[PDB]
Amino acid sequence: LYFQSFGLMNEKFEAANTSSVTTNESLLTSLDQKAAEAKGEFAKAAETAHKVQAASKEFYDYIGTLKTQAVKGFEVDKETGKMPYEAMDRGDNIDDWFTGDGYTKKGNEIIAKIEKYKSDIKAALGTDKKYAGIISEVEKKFDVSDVKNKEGIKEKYLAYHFKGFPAIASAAKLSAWQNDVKKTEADVYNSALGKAAVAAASYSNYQAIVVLDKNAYFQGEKVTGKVVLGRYDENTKPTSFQGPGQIVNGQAVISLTAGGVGEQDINGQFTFLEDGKNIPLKFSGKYVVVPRPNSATISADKMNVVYRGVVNPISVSFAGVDANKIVASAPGLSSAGKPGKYNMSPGQGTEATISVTGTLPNGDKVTDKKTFRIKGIPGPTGTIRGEMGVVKGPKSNLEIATIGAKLLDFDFEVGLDVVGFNMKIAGQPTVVVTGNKMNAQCKSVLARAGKGDQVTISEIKTKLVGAGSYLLPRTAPVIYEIQ
Amino acid sequence: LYFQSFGLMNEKFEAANTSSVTTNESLLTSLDQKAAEAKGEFAKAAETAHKVQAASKEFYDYIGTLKTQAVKGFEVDKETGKMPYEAMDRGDNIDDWFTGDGYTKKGNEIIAKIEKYKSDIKAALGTDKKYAGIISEVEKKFDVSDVKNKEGIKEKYLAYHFKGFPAIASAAKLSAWQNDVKKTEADVYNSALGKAAVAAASYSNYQAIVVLDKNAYFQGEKVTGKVVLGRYDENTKPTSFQGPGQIVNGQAVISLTAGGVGEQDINGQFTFLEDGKNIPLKFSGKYVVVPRPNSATISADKMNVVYRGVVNPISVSFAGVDANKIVASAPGLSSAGKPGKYNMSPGQGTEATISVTGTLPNGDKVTDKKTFRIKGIPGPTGTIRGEMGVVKGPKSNLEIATIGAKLLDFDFEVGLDVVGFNMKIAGQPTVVVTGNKMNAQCKSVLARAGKGDQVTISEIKTKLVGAGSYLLPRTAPVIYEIQ
């Protein structure tokens, strides 16, 4: 009596099919957008989803053709659109599917179509575990093997399910097959998106990398940095990369010729188009350009000497330390008026040690020292009229002469003054003289001298003026020969 | 006449429900395993999936209770398990759902149960776009508002759908509701896994980082490295991290006190448990420990001197260059037998330039030079019996005396020999002597000398032996005074 119950079942199933076309389209679009934007596995998943789209459509559409044939000759209402369910109690419309016990060319054609759907779905989806349940359900729901009846004899699937059935019951069964196709379809679209995203999120797609803040350290300094999981995937395809390199497996191998001097930046970015928004991941890498070593230390080992009573210029440098962060100290040491330039006037003793402390850019203190031998000024050489050794000329020139002293090859500009000496001519005692000139006593003692006679000037007392004033212990004697 | 068609519909739907319990369990397990292993978004998705599990179960089970009531009093076959479909043409069993036009306490109870299912699903799933279609379908399929009949009057949903219907038709409708619950369930399990994995794969979860091979360069050197997308996500939870730091947002901030000397490694790993396998991502970070600057250059500016005819020891060093990679050259320069130690014996000229080339660890060549002034050996001081100036004693001591030369405060061990001199006593001409001893001519010339008399020894010819032999131009004179 109740054909309305079959009418309602068909109404329910068709409403699910109409709702399904929009929801399945929306799921496919999500997968397409994800594939176009992120590529990799999402492009592999979209390829699968579209193969299943075409196999589901072919079958769904073909089912619609069989439904049309089942409801043939029944006028759908003009406004409501619903068929007269009470009038649909015979399956006369689908008689041409079967001949006697078997099928016609049409019946064998339906079976081959159901078969093609299962085969296509099986081929589109792989052998992958993620899809094994989807396939098993398709093969179960669409198992077209002969059905045993109450007697236990086998009946051909289409005859068993549709032969002599009410037209409305047959339309409801076919609408239920359409529900199964739409369900499987959505299952694949949601399973494909998930399989692809799980693969993209796999920790097999990274390399552990140490990024230290600097690569060179001194002992005791805090080494600082991070260890990150850096993407290492072929399927990682940035929309763009700006920087001194090209993308290979989601990374950029970078190179550049080191800039002039100081701290330098390696700036750029990756951009990713994701869910309609552009994702910029900017970077500012850092390196430093240091000057190459350029200062050798070349010293004469016997020359580490400072003279007492003179201003000894000293140069100080400490490679690896800025000239402004170098401090030299010692007794007798002062600044000379240029960076790293000092003056040493040694105190008492045999050695003078100059100590140097440098402050490194990290604030570290570094120390070195050098010992210089303190030497007394060399003995000057006595002179008569500025000549050394044996001075010749008239007796007259000796009487008005100045007794002096010279320091030969001495690299220091000093003042030398004779404060006394001893004069001697044969036959008369030595005259001790105060001053650098011949006494009235000298001139009288010389009255007896003439051509050939030598006058010795010895025990010359030389006063030096440099950094202080000193009475030098020894000056070489000088001789005058009258001619 | 056909109750078998309703029997088959119910058989189909129940077979889908039995198949669904195992497939939905398998989907939930995948999500649970992923949540336990990778956590983050997969734990958020599993929380959603379990809320929907309990709401679907409550409803599915309650539907089973209504089905039992619909098929009450019908003996299922002992072996086959199938109900007698022909015998089930009345809905007498579910009469207690309705009273007159309305419902009983039981009928209102079914409506409240359907309502609770939709509300629970709506509450379990959020307002998130990924789940908007799932919710819309639940609200559509389970819309329990009054249904307009053929006359256009509204009929209560349960009365319209189940009042006076064949028991087998009512069981099939309820089994179809069960199919909808299982479908929605699977939809949520597959949508939750996908939403979570898409979020985990989002490029918003990275920082672009420059990892250079070194941080310090000289101008012109190839700066080398990579730029990687390093994971920066709170939801990135490694199973373990070994290294000198702790994990914060999928990264490890690392620190250590720099080791002794040379190339050092920062070794460790991240491990991730994924799909039953442990994923080890090992790292070996590199740093170098360099010695702090320790060598100052302290020089006496007036002392950059080398003497002609002597072996002048020179020291050479070049900070930033290994002692074995330093090469010094100059005319007169040779090795002294220790690293960086040389000997200079200058040629002709006023200056000697020592050039130094260093080879840096990268093979680079660095050059510096220093000019030294070449000075002739200072004039020696003449001696009689090894005494300088004015030598006193008997005439006897003068006759057998050796005339010599001394270099005072000369820091070089040389050989000095007198090869000639001039002897002079008053009243007699100068005696020119070959040798360093008093001639027979000298001894005869001295026969006339006595107490008080001075003898001058001048024009001393000194031969020097150092690095070669030289006749020194000037030697200071010496005087003898007989007493």
Residue numbers in the entry:
A (entry chain A), B (entry chain A): -5 to -1, 36 to 513
From the paper:
PorL and PorM (GldL and GldM) are IM proteins that interact via their trans-membrane segments. PorM (or GldM) is therefore a central structural component of the T9SS and an interesting target for structure and function studies. Here, we present the atomic structures of the periplasmic domains of both PorM and GldM, that exhibit 22% amino-acid identity, and provide information regarding the contribution of each domain for interaction with PorK and PorN. Finally, we suggest that due to the structural similarity between PorM and GldM, both classical T9SS and Gld T9SS membrane core complexes might assemble and function in similar ways.
The GldM (accession number GI: 58531935) and PorM periplasmic domains (GI: 188595218) (GldMp, PorMp) were cloned from residues 36–513 and 36–516, respectively. GldMp crystallized readily, and its structure was solved using the Se edge of a SeMet derivative for phasing. One molecule was present in the asymmetric unit, but strong contacts exist with a symmetry-related protein in the crystal. The GldMp dimer is elongated and straight with overall dimensions of ~180 Å × 50 Å × 35 Å. The dimer structure contains four domains, D1–D4 with seven α-helices and 22 β-strands in the sequence (α1−α2−α3−α4−α5) (β1−β2−β3−β4−β5−β6) (β7−β8−β9−β10−β11−β12−β13−β14) (β15−β16−α6−β17−β18−β19−α7−β20−β21−β22). Domain D1 (32-232) is formed by helices 1–5 in an up and down fold. The D1 domain dimers are packed together through helices α1. Each D2 domain swaps its β-strands 1 and 2 with the other D2 domain, whereas D3 domains swap β-strand 7. The D4 domains (406–513) are not subject to domain swapping but are packed together in the dimer. Remarkably, with a 180 Å-extended conformation, GldM spans most of the periplasmic space, as the distances between the IM and OM associated with T3SS, T4SS, and T6SS have been found to be ~26013, ~17014, and 180 Å15, respectively.
